[PDB]
Design a protein around this ligand. Sequence first.
Ligand SMILES: */C=C(/CC(=O)O)C(=O)O
Ligand SMILES: */C=C(/CC(=O)O)C(=O)O
Ligand SMILES: */C=C(/CC(=O)O)C(=O)O
Ligand SMILES: */C=C(/CC(=O)O)C(=O)O
Ligand SMILES: [Mg+2]
Ligand SMILES: [Mg+2]
Ligand SMILES: [Mg+2]
Ligand SMILES: [Mg+2]
Lengths: 424, 424, 425, 425
Amino acid sequence: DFYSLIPSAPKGRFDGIERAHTAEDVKRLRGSVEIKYSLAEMGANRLWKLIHEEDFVNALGALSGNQAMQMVRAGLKAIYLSGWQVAADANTASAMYPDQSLYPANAGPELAKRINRTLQRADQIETAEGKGLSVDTWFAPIVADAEAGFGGPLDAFEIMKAYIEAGAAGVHFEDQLASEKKCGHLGGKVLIPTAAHIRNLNAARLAADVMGTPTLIVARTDAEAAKLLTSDIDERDQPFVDYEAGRTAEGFYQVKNGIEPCIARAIAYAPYCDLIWMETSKPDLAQARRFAEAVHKAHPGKLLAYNCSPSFNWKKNLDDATIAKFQRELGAMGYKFQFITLAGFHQLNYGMFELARGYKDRQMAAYSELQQAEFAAEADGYTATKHQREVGTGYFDAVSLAITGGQSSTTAMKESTETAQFKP
Amino acid sequence: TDFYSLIPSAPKGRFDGIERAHTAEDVKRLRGSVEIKYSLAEMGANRLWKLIHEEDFVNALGALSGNQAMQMVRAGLKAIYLSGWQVAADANTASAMYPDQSLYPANAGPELAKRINRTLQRADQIETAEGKGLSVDTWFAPIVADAEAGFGGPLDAFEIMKAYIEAGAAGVHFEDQLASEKKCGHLGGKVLIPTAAHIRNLNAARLAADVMGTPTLIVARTDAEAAKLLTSDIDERDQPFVDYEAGRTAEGFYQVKNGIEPCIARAIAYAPYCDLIWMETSKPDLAQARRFAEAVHKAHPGKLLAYNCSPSFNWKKNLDDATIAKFQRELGAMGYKFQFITLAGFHQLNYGMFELARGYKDRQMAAYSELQQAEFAAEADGYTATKHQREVGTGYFDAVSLAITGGQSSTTAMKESTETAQFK
Amino acid sequence: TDFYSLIPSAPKGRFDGIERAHTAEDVKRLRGSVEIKYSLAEMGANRLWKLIHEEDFVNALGALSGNQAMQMVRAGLKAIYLSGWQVAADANTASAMYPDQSLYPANAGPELAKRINRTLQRADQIETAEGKGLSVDTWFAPIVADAEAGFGGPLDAFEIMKAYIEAGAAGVHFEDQLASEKKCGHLGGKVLIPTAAHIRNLNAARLAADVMGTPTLIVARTDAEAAKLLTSDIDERDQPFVDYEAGRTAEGFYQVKNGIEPCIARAIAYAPYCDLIWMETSKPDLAQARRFAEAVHKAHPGKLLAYNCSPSFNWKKNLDDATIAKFQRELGAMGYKFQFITLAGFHQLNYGMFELARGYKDRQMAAYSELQQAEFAAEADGYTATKHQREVGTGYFDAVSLAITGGQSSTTAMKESTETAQFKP
Amino acid sequence: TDFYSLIPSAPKGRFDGIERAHTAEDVKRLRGSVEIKYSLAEMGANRLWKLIHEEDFVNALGALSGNQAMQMVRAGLKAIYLSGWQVAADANTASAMYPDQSLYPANAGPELAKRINRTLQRADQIETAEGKGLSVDTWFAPIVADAEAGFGGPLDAFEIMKAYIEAGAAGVHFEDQLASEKKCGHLGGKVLIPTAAHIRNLNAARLAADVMGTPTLIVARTDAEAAKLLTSDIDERDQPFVDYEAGRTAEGFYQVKNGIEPCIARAIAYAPYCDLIWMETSKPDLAQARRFAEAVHKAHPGKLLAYNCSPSFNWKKNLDDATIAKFQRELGAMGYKFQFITLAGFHQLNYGMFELARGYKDRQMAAYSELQQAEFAAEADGYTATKHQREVGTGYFDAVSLAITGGQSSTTAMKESTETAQFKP
Ligand SMILES: */C=C(/CC(=O)O)C(=O)O
Ligand SMILES: */C=C(/CC(=O)O)C(=O)O
Ligand SMILES: */C=C(/CC(=O)O)C(=O)O
Ligand SMILES: */C=C(/CC(=O)O)C(=O)O
Ligand SMILES: [Mg+2]
Ligand SMILES: [Mg+2]
Ligand SMILES: [Mg+2]
Ligand SMILES: [Mg+2]
């Protein structure tokens, strides 16, 4: 069966999960040798534990390894990897793009590798200091964006494998047309048929199976706002097609949007994913409850995911008490993975704009204020004021000393200004 | 033929007082047979040259991403600093976190310079397409970039200089450390190379700029204020600082008397082979900065200087508020025309995300809404990234799509976006 | 109102007969506020334009590495072909071996074009420093490169076009396949997009060249000879070929009647929006090539055409030796002015190393010495890489070192090399 | 106390005779808190360890691409060599052509090792999915890879070792040259580092493997046969070879008496800290190879040695045909159990494409059809790449598509391909 093919999968991991392929297909397609993907195994099993043990798992979108390291240091238990942020400031074309699948398909997995490598160094630093870790683990699970798979089922298969090699714990795929892909909160989205998205989800599961990892799959539907559909071939989509409207010049069908096609698609996708996610136009607890209840009528207890999107104007949509309870209330509905997709972008850009403005106005006064804020945050667990230790200078000092039997004349920390000027 | 005919964009006087070990005919022999233009490198170098002569001083912050650089320019800063320390920490081509020891691959700095220029390019495209003029003097603020110790010998310095020119950097700095033992200026264990050996690296950088045909600026850095080791006493200019009583180390290094005296001697020896001179210092000391400038200007009147306002200093520990507030202005009057906070982008990024993540853990969406409200508040001072879809170019690419389709595209993004509906 | 003023290096008449969906004011609006030069793209596009109008025909081989391209130029070929199939096989930015289905990341083709131009650049630097003139007309032979199906929609085609221009490509080809189901021209299971949709891709590529300011050539390819599937019948130009009795597939694809007739129709529709037209074919057939050329020229007299001399054909199975020998010459006379063997680099690389490895297993150094002697024997025909230290620039970087050091370096490489000692004539 | 528990896949006796500067507690302190497996590195190192103790000798060729490595394995070679010279020439992460002087970025060699393993993985997937067993003993032939002079100091050697292990290399070689003046072994101007300094690099590499938990092989290389310069005389083991009367060069280098004697002394000093020892030589000379082996074996009986069968030698100028034919066999009996032609991939690629391009210029499709017919004729000896669609995995991805769709995909590629139609047996 499939548990034999995925040895690290915990008991019950695939309860309720259907597959288009067989276990014999997996053995036929996985090659003749066992290659381990340790960070993917550990991350997927830790993510599986967390979303079932916590009241909910909340995360922020990280655009760099350092951002992810501070998220874990502050006590967050998972990391979100946003394709929007990859497009904006962290992709393999070295360009700034809007969120339209314009960057090359390897960019997401390359960012996941960067994040895991930073977490790996943070763990090496603390392990070498010999006083225990300052966190439960540095290897918080990464839930990562595979957009619409960058093409067809074989493209979804490849990006899933790439994320697994990079050490991602879960990967999400959405029912948009890859050639017209959009941020969930932009106009002009085009859906693919329900069956076509199920093929991408099955492609992602086959990839995890042939890699031997229990990687989580998140199915996302964009049907709340999308008014276009590539094809009406699937009888499940036809009730929503406005036939009197005719097709667009591109050949797209026009559909009725809203929660109703999201519920239908979510229920159809449920056997083929581990969590379900519906993009929404507004942060709306009542709408979130309606979606959860409808999904759970067909699929009791199904795990759900919710994008707490910065594309919403929060204090305009909601009062303060609702903002404060929002994630707790979603958690009780069954949204066990909640994430702020663009948080890293907004933090990075705001923080540097304000520092640069203060620097232009007051020069070193502005920077000393940041440094003093850093000092004040050390009581709350912040450590990066001592930047030489933070990036591993002490760790590599210890590597050098082990190589040289203690005798190297060129170690870094002893006579550093960090040691001299940042003493506790 | 002289060097001005080989570098067509060089302004009058660009090379006054500059000496070269090679000839103009060497440059013709070594540059290939076809003219290749490096437009951004030309523009940046000439803008940097004008700025450092006309401004009281040019101050910059170290940027670790294109978005950080974009906000620096938007806030009104006139130049961008590219720190090799930050490349090592969070932005290199080995996708690892490193201490500042030249551990990452030699292409990483130039790759980051290219990312920065690409983000600025898109920022300029967005505003140009909107048709209301630029909100900045120029988006292409000159980049002064870190080439460390050249990543080997003179040929390696030659190659990294060319790579930075291709990436569009305006100025590049090289230091007199041993590449195999390179350190951050404020770490211990630095090893100097002979004065003559660093002059070879600087000549290699100048030959690279000459054969690329660009008036790229060269900054010569000396680490002799703190370095206590030297690879070889072969150069008679270094022998007066060698502690021959101490004998050599187990690795064969000579021990040297460090401090401002060997910095002054090396700076005066380097001066004809660079455009700015930089001495790393252990403390932010205006009296020491004045003594260095006065000594250099005795031998080379009017020589432009650079100064590292390093986060490796504990600023309030060394200086009172009045001295911090006047620090850069007083340095500028001494001749320090380029001043930069090397690790500013690292500290801003890590502090900001630690504090957001900590608040998010404790209070979930209340913490994010506080950030969003701060962003809205900053718009009166020029911040724009709250509208993140515009910021990354969604409106620009909407305009591209409309030009392609003669106006008939059914799938543009901004019109029905939540940004348009919720961020007025 | 003039595009020539937006493209300073375009020669007189470059855009005769070329239509654009966008205006010159659109270009000015979308190109940013500063002029960035793309010198190798300018030089290559203009050299390619001259070549295809002055030579009887320009033939090329698919190069999968800079070294392959260098030897092509050294041997006297005037252009270089960059194959996406070979990128997928052995030279892509996912570091994987892929079949030809647009599975690799969209930057891989431009990155290979940059590698090729960098190798040619070093070859030119070596000979320029030696001071005895070049051994070729130019090292910077124009590169015609594969943008497959644009890797998505028109904006993706726009982006890969810009990337190829930055990398210094001279011409770029785009095909009317669905990128999510893209195939090699000679595989089954190809899915066409509507005629109008491919015209949008071609216009996006022209807009990219325009905003970059370069007269880069655009090649339009149709896969309609063999493709039996089509995403949508929305375009009335495609409806005459839709098999409505067969119905749609489970994916919703329309089934179409493939062959020469839809190729001719699509080619004539694409012609105002490209510089060369190319139809993939199932066999190397001179008669079919003439029929396609004649039909296109009935609508667009003198239109430049391109032809894939594909290794996916079994050549001696299809043709006798006399027809093989005259094949490219006859095509050139019909108007096929750019002809290319797509997978030549793959077959040369894999055949050559299989045979060397087999001989090495059998006979060890005897097999390698046979290669080295063959290299020596080819020097009379212009081969130089036997002296591999010179070939990769060791002498050039010696000259760099000597200019840096005033002539007095203890660590120059060539003087005491075994190359200088053992490879003298 | 024990290193075998830290390296779980290490076979019994793997570290016999091996000394370490560091302790087992150092490894535990420096390796992080989680077990990460490096499966290809384990399998390759253990297979290479087996091969060099069971074969008469293991011979290899330098591969510059995954496709080259795939054909080496298909032809029956049992290991793959990865040359930094070839990385510099045509396969590095700066996308430039370089002479062999450590000019490219330090990640380039490991990136090529990853490419090679990925191609081999696809080859194995193809044959596994076809269900008829493999056509080779294994597709995962061990890779022995070039780490040059470590790209800096001991910490740089530590990092490049880890990168090769992540990429799945089986063994890695490090040489006693100054990284800032690094040369190909057969160029002039080499500069040695002190004996103690190279031992520190070797120890850094072993610490890297220890913390990664892999039994990766380490090859120590000495360049003292031709190097006439030395950075420092601080090590008393080097002082007997320093020409003190000559003084230091202008750069501060000591001048040394080169030849076999400093190679023997350095090799004997390096032996506890590596698994194989390699001395670069100026000529392919069996007598010098025997003198070196006999002297190393007087101090370290049974020590395994490596030998570069370099294309930088003019083989027929140095040696008669009989000596060429027995060369590797004779070296094997002396203890040279890993033998490799460093630049074989460069010479095969460049010679093959020059001769193809020359014939194409002269005779167009006749030249290519000759290659294709040669390919057909090589199929009886096991060549398969004439069917290029199968070779790169098109049939494998067809099977993936059919598994995803339960047999229903309309867009599979092989059934109606020209390969199936025109390349039938
Ligand atoms: C752009 C979306 C996120 C996504 O991944 O679609 C948003 O606005 O949060
Ligand atoms: C590490 C230095 C900067 C540098 O580039 O050396 C510092 O502490 O500012
Ligand atoms: C795979 C084709 C080439 C192409 O680019 O489609 C062939 O067989 O030549
Ligand atoms: C350049 C050498 C090989 C090496 O790796 O040094 C040769 O000529 O074989
Ligand atoms: Mg996304
Ligand atoms: Mg630095
Ligand atoms: Mg192709
Ligand atoms: Mg080498």
